[model samples]
Target: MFTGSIVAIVTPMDEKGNVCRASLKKLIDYHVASGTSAIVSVGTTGESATLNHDEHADVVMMTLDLADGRIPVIAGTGANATAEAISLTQRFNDSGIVGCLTVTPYYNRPSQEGLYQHFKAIAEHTDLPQILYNVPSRTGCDLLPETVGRLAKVKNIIGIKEATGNLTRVNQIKELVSDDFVLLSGDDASALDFMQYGGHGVISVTANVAARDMAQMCKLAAEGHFAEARVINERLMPLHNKLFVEPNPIPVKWACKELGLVATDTLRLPMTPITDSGRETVRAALKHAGLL
Candidate 1:
């Protein structure tokens, strides 16, 4: 069920750095109308790190409620600690979310077996469908292919968000897992090609601003219209590249505010607002994509 242009949505916060419910509602309605396949609430792009435990769960639950069945919502219930991850996973069981996007244990640099054990323990604890997120750049640990194949056998550990952007893993993962195990791309720039290389879809950052384009790009690729998808992807290539010109969510949150898609671009400390040059770069990208 988790596939196709699932936006790792940015949480809209006001100038005071509080979750802006009004802006959140507006963003959700925008995605619903834009035909985004799903919404990933409070993921890395959502500034999950800065938000407290209470705020984190609240935003995710709020997203599910705001969506109101027009779209599906997935919770970013990942933590660096195994106990924390398990606790987070269990919290969502009765929350009515479609699933949870549990990222690999970050910082501690868990070994492959540790990764396997970490996720498997989470799976054992909850019935929620789990999608493993492996973005090594952000998290020091890399969940290798063999461990993924091993985890694929575990119940409820149903799919993976392969953020490494390595196309070779597509065939490698396909060979290792069963047909139904979902394979989604986590990199926006490489997403279209990832689908062409046999990935099911993407959990995207660029999708936050260009929802329709990203969704349509995936739809085109799914229908074997690579040429059409490439045209759209080419237009979006600037956004994909520039959004990360700063760390994620900084430029993207600005782009969202620039589009008037949200109320403010307020981010927490440690993740200050995008710089002037960063803003100019993002603005140019928005214009390039005809979004400005």
Candidate 2:
């Protein structure tokens, strides 16, 4: 199981909003030096919704190339269409990513059974392990724990990123699956408590700027050191809450720029820069976390 603080890293873009490979290497080095457990390239925090198909593959490929086996990498191979999802998964299968973080199909609102079939098909297509992503608010559908139980039986479909923030979902899903079924918390705010509730780690947005602290908290949490992790997590509360002040990759992209990880917080269309008010909020959050 890929454990600890797995960063849903932001894809650094240039002034023209194209993927900036030069800056990406700098961002990856910070996390590698900080001991981040894994990397989720082109996930939502990386603005997966905005990147063109070819650009998406390029960013994932670049992340893997730069990571160079220092830490594990999971490609974000999700789509609103199952066939499309499979295509991306297959493409990245031999691209050296450790696994696939396949999210629920957004804007489609597939039924529980449809969701099950979708993921099951992707797992069978790729030999790599698959980790399900359930950000229902983003996808417009929830993968119920009962349905998750069904998918758990699928061959090669191994764990889930439970972003719902309801800790009970962790316990509920854990009950329905085998011991090896990985339960990763996709919520940064309650990640420490999520670990307390048997979560393995996080697919974290906060880790984009605060990688060192986030990794330390996860390390302490995984070692059954809740009190120690809580201390670090408490200091990170502002970051966890504010990174989403706008939609993801907005505030987080800005935060990274301020920290000098990226050249600018440039993003593609329909995803704009943070508002002045949001900038103030993000700056305060970073200052609170001692990153500014």
Candidate 3:
């Protein structure tokens, strides 16, 4: 149900860090118009870590409402606690979301076996098709392809957002999974190349700022236009690099505001505004992409 530049969309917040209803609508409308295939609301880029459970559910529900079936919405339901993750996943069972993106349990550093069980239990509790998310840099836990192969056998666990940026991992995971199992890049810098290596698409942060280009790049790649797709990727490489300069959602939220896509770049505590140097980096990258 997921493919082609599925944006890990940032949750737009107001000056006081409340979800900005107006801006959220604007972002959704922008993506629907830009040819983005789907939206991953409240994923890592959406500030899911800091949002309270109620706020998280509300944002996802609101996103579905705003989208109004124009584009598929995927909810971020990852939690360190298996029970919490299951509850969060079930919360959206009756909602209109197309699926759920569940990140690996972070901080606790579970063993590979534990990771497999954690995801398996969540999948068993809900009918929502679960996509495993592996970003060791932030999660301190790697969901290995071997274990992923095991989970692929579990019912309703459909795919993964492999963010390691190692292109070989694409085929490595592909080697173990079924033909229908999905492989999506979680890193924007390597996303185009990831597609070249048979990845279905990306859960992109850069897409929040450069929606049309990201969507077009994925479309071109899907059509087997590697050379043409590379041109777009080259132009967007700076954005892909700079968006993460200040730890995702920081620079990305700023870029959103800079492009007038959102009203404020305000993020909750522990995720502050972008620094001067970071802003300079993003601005230059945006100008390089001809977005500034």
The digit string of per-residue lDDT tens for model 1 on 1-292 reads: 6778999999999999999999999989999999999999999999999999899989988998899999999999999999999988887888989989999999899899999999999999998899999899899988988999999999998899999989998888888998999899999989998999999999999999999999999999999999999999999999999999898889999999999989999999899879999999999999999998
- Give the TM-scores of the predictions, in the order they appear: 0.99, 0.98, 0.98
1 or 2, which is superior by lDDT? 1
Model 3 residue runs over 4 Å out of place are none
Q: Which stretches of candidate 2 lie over 4 Å from their true place?
A: none
Candidate 3 lDDT score relative to the true structure: 0.93
Winner on lDDT between 1 and 3 is 3
Expressed as tens digits, the lDDT of each residue in 1-292 for candidate 3 is: 5788899999999999999999999999999999988999899999998999999999999999999999999999999999999999988998999899999999999999999899999999998889999999999999989999999999999999999998989998999999889999999989998999999999999889899999999999989999999999999899999998788889998999999999999999999778899989999999999898
Worst 10 residues of 1 by lDDT: 87-96
Ranking by lDDT: 3, 1, 2
Clashing pairs in 1: none
* Candidates ranked, most accurate by TM-score first: 1, 3, 2
**lDDT scores for all predictions?**
0.92, 0.91, 0.93
**Best-matching candidate per lDDT:** 3
